[PDB]
C-alpha cells in the first residue's frame, strides 16, 4: 500500500536527496527522519507542511499517487533513514548515507565455487565478489545454466573505504547439494557504471 524508493541514497554534503513514496490511496501523508541511535522525527505532514524546527531545505511534493521528499543542500544532520507514512502504514524506508566522491572505478569480479569440505554437509554456497568499485550503485544477477535466479541469494556491502573511497560487495548463492549437482554452469553477472558491458564470471561444476 506504501512503496518507498529508493532503498538507499549515497550522497555528498551539499547535494540533494530525492525520496519518493507511492500510495495506493490518497490521504494525509507524513515524512519521518530517523538519525542513528535516535528516535524518529516528524519532518513533513499532510504532504508538504513542514513540522516546527524543520528548515525550508526540506520540501514535500505530490504528483498523482507519488509523494516526494526532497532535501536540498544536505548537511551532516540530514543523513539517516527516512520514512513515509499514511495512517498506521509506513514505507520500507530510505537510507540516506554519506558518500565521498571519487573517480569511477569498475569492480574486480571473482567467483568462488563451493568448497569440497562444505559439499559434504549437503549445502552449496557459491560466492561472487565485487572488489573496490565506485559509485556504490551496482547490480548482481546469478545464473544457473543460463536461468536467472531469484530468492536464493543474499548480498552484503562494506562501508566506503576510508583510504580509497571504494566499496566492495559480496553475493552468496545458496543451494542444496542435490540441487547443485543437477547443474553445470554457475555464473554471476555484474553491471556497474565503470563497465562498458555487464561482466560475467562463471565456472563449470566438476572441471578445474
Amino acid at each position: 500500500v506504501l512503496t518507498q524508493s529508493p532503498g538507499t541514497l549515497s550522497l555528498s554534503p551539499g547535494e540533494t536527496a530525492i525520496i519518493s513514496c507511492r500510495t495506493s490511496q490518497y490521504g494525509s501523508l507524513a515524512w519521518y527522519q530517523q538519525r542513528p541511535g535516535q528516535a524518529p522525527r516528524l519532518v513533513i505532514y499532510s504532504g508538504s507542511t513542514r513540522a516546527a524546527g524543520i528548515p525550508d531545505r526540506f520540501s514535500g511534493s505530490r504528483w498523482g499517487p507519488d509523494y516526494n521528499l526532497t532535501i536540498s543542500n544536505l548537511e551532516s544532520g540530514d543523513f539517516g533513514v527516512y520514512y513515509c507514512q499514511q495512517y498506521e502504514f509506513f514505507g520500507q524506508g530510505t537510507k540516506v548515507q554519506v558518500d565521498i566522491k571519487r573517480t569511477v572505478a569498475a569492480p574486480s569480479v571473482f567467483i568462488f565455487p563451493p568448497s569440497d569440505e562444505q559439499l559434504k554437509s549437503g549445502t552449496a554456497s557459491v560466492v561472487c565478489l565485487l572488489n573496490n568499485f565506485y559509485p556504490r550503485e551496482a547490480k548482481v544477477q546469478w545464473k544457473v545454466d543460463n536461468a536467472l535466479q531469484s530468492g536464493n541469494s543474499q548480498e552484503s556491502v562494506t562501508e566506503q573505504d576510508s583510504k580509497d573511497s571504494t566499496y566492495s560487495l559480496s553475493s552468496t548463492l545458496t543451494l542444496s547439494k542435490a540441487d547443485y549437482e543437477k547443474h553445470k554452469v554457475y555464473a554471476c553477472e555484474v553491471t556497474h557504471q565503470g563497465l562498458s558491458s555487464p561482466v560475467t564470471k562463471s565456472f563449470n561444476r566438476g572441471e578445474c
Binding site: 490511496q25 490521504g27 495512517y87 498506521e88 502504514f89 509506513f90
Partner: protein, 342 residues
Amino acid sequence: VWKDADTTLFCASDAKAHETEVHNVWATHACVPTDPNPQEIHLENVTENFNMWKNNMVEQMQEDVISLWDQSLQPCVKLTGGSVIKQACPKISFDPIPIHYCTPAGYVILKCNDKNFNGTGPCKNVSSVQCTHGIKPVVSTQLLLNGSLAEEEIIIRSENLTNNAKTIIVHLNKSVEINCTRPSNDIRKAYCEINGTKWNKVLKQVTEKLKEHFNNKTIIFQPPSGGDLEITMHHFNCRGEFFYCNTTQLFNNTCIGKGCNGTITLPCKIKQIINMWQGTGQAMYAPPIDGKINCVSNITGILLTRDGGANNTSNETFRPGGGNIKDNWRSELYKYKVVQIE
C-alpha cells in the same frame, strides 16, 4: 444571505413543573416552553454543506447533559484526583425527556432532509427551522437507545472510514427493542431480552451496508478489545441505576451467515461503583431500589470501531464502540447546523 457560525443556543422542552423527575427539573430552569406551531421553511435551489463531526451544537448539548448529571446524580462518594467527596445520595426519579435546541435572533438552523444523507458533504433538500427536533439526552455505550431512525436505508456514518481511530455510527432504519429487567426477590444481577429474529435480520442488513463501504469484504463482528467496563459492555442508566450488559451474544456472526432464532438474553449487572463519563474518576452509589426495575428501549443505532493494521486479509473486523458521549449527540444533531443571517 447567511454563513456558517456558532452561537449560544437556548433550550426548549415540555418539562412539567410538578414533576420530581430529574430531566424535568433541569429543563424547567434551563429551558423555555416549546412552540405549539413551529415554522419550517423548505429552501428551493439551495444546496448546503454539512459536517456532523464538526458541529459545535454538539459541544453545547454536551455541556448541558454534564451539568444536568452533576446537579442530579450526586454520588454518596466521589473519588477524583486523589481526594474524596462524601455527599448525600438519595434515590431519584430518572427518565430522559426530549430536548430541543434553538437559535437566538440573527441566527437560524439549517436542516438537511436528504433521505440518504450520511453526515458530511452537500445536501439538496435544505429547510430552515428555529429549533431542532426533541432529543432525549440518553447516555450509553455500544448501542444508541431511544433515538431517531434513518428514513430510508441504513446509514453508515464516520468522519473518515479509512481512519481506524474514527468512530463509526451505524444508523438503523428499523428499531429493535431491548427489554432490560432487574426482577424482585443477587439483587445486583439483571438481564436484557432482545428478539433474535428481528435483530439478526437487522444485523445482517448492517453487514450488507458495510460491504458497500468496504469492497464486498467479509464483515466480521468481535467483542471489544479492551478498556473499562463502561465501554466493553453496553452501559446505560435505567430508572437511576447503572446497568452493565454483556453484548457478546448480540453480535453473533453465526446468526448472520439456524437456531439463534429465539430470545436473546444478555447477562447484566447493576454496579454501585462506576467510572464517571463526565470525565473525573469513580463514583459510589447506594444499592439498587427494591422491586422490579425495567426499561424497554429502542435500539436505534450502533457504535463501532473498525480493526486496522498492516495486514492483507479480505475481511474487515468491527467491535462495539462508544465512550465519547459527544458522538451520542452527533447521531441526533447530524442534520443540523447553525448559520448567521448576514
